[PDB]
């Protein structure tokens, strides 16, 4: 229920790493945006 912002989303990239990334401002990383990133 409204877990990440309106604009990163968690995908799994190649190895398997549940990368979020941000469709706002373009951050991809694979920490998660409620946290730290």
Same mark, same amino acid.
């Given at each position: 229920?409204?877990?990440? /912002? /309106?604009?990163?989303?968690? !995908?799994? *990239?190649? =190895?398997?790493? +549940? !990368? !979020? !990334? =941000?469709? =706002? *401002?373009? +951050?991809? *990383?694979? *920490?998660? /945006?409620?946290?730290?990133?």
């Amino acid at each position: 229920s409204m877990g990440l /912002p /309106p604009g990163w989303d968690e !995908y799994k *990239t190649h =190895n398997g790493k +549940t !990368y !979020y !990334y =941000n469709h =706002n *401002t373009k +951050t991809s *990383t694979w *920490t998660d /945006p409620r946290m730290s990133s």
